[PDB]
Structures are given as C-alpha cells and as structure tokens.
C-alpha cells in the first residue's frame, strides 16, 4: 500500500455537469432527483498503473463566485470542464478559466473534459443547436482546443451513462504523478 495525496479542482461554467461528474464518480449513479450547486469534501481512491493515490476531488461555481480563488491553492490537477451542448462554453475556456489558472495556479496540470457526451447524437440538440445552427461539439475540435491551452490530456464523457467518468479521474491521477 501507499498514501499519495493529490488535490483536484474542477473548474468551468454552469451546465457542463461539474457536480454530476463529482457526484456520479463518487456514487456511480446520476442524481436524477436533485443536485446541489457544489459537491465537495470527497476523496477517490485510484489504484492505477501500480500506484495507489488518494485523489481529493473539489469543485467551484460562480452563486459562490468569490470562492473560486479560495479553492485554487495546492492543486495537483485542474479539471477544466465544458459541455458539448454549450459550445459557447469552449469559448470561455480560452477567455476566462485558462486566464485564471495561470494567475491562481502558475503551471499546474489541466485535463480537458467534454461532458454531456449524450447531448451530441441527440434530436433536441441537433434540433436546437442547429436552430442557432451550432452543430454540437465534435471530438477533434475539443481535443485540439486542449492542445492550445496546455492540457497534458483530453477527455470527454457522460455521467448519465457513466462511460469515461473513471478515466477523467484516472488520467488526472497520472497527471498528478507526471
């Protein structure tokens, strides 16, 4: 056994699924009834490529705007997260969110998460994004937006479906052990 202890702060706009990522990964079941603003005070255990890490998993909001700065220190990994149904949200990833880390977090890893993977091959999205014609975010459009900013790694995922969720945390593990 070991005891590697690593902070992870999840940053981003509203409606990416921050807290549905933070919860679901904990409990392994989507909050279908009610979800808070923020869900904090959580540790994941991840036994990955040999090493066992205690990956502490924090969060942020905006509703608590003046709390983003209080949560940045000691970060061993940032989860900057966007939502594929709000490509307007990848538009903030370069203005704000990256402009904030390199103030409250000089260096520090970033792993780009692209949530709401489900609202991509949907009707009501292709019917609404496409009503402002905004074709839901494609993979290589993100993947390479993550290269620009610095993301040692790229991820997308769903928390309704739960496919990816562990890798969005496991890839971070390695990211805090790199």
Is the Cβ of residue 10 or residue 151 nearer to Mg ion in the bound state?
10
What is the rounded distance in angstroms from the CA atom of residue 145 to the CA atom of residue 62? 23
Annotated binding residue at 31?
yes
How near is the Cβ of 11 to ligand GDP at its closest, in Å?
Answer: 9
Q: What is the largest CA-CA distance in the chain?
A: 54
Name which of residues 31 to 70 contact Mg ion (CB under 5 A).
35
Q: How far is CA 128 from CA 14, 110, 119, 139, in A?
A: 19, 30, 11, 19
Give one DSSP letter per residue of 86-97, joined into a string.
-GGGTTTTTTTT
Q: Is 19 in the site for Mg ion (CB under 5 A)?
A: yes
Annotated binding residue at 13?
yes
Annotated binding residue at 146?
no
Is the Cβ of residue 75 or residue 174 nearer to ligand GDP in the bound state?
75
Residues near 62 by beta carbon (within 8 Å), at least 6 away in sequence? 13, 14, 68
Residues that bind ligand GDP (CB under 6 A): 12, 14-20, 35, 115-116, 118-119, 158-160
Residue 5: HSE in the Cβ half-sphere, 13 Å Cα cutoff: 3
Is the Cβ of residue 53 or residue 165 nearer to ligand GDP in the bound state?
165
> Which residues in this chain contact Mg ion in the complex, by CB under 5 A?
19, 35
Detail the residues annotated as belonging to a binding site: 12-19, 30-37, 59-62, 115-118, 158-160
């Amino acid at each position: 056994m070991a005891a590697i202890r690593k902070k992870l702060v999840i940053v981003g706009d509203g409606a990416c699924g921050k807290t549905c990522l933070l919860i679901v990964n904990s409990k392994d079941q989507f909050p279908e009834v009610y979800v808070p603003t923020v869900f904090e005070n959580y540790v994941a255990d991840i036994e990955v490529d040999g090493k066992q890490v205690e990956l502490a998993l924090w969060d942020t909001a905006g509703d608590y705007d003046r709390l983003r700065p209080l949560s940045y220190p000691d970060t061993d990994v940032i989860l900057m997260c966007f939502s594929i149904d709000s490509p307007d949200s990848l538009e903030n990833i370069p203005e704000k969110w990256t402009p904030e880390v390199k103030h409250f977090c000089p260096n520090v890893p970033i792993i780009l998460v692209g949530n709401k993977k489900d609202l991509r091959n949907d009707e009501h999205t292709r019917r609404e994004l496409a009503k402002m014609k905004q074709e839901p975010v494609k993979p290589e459009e993100g993947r390479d937006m993550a290269n620009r900013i610095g993301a040692f790694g790229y991820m997308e995922c769903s928390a309704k479906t739960k496919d990816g969720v562990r890798e969005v945390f496991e890839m971070a593990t390695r990211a805090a052990l790199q």
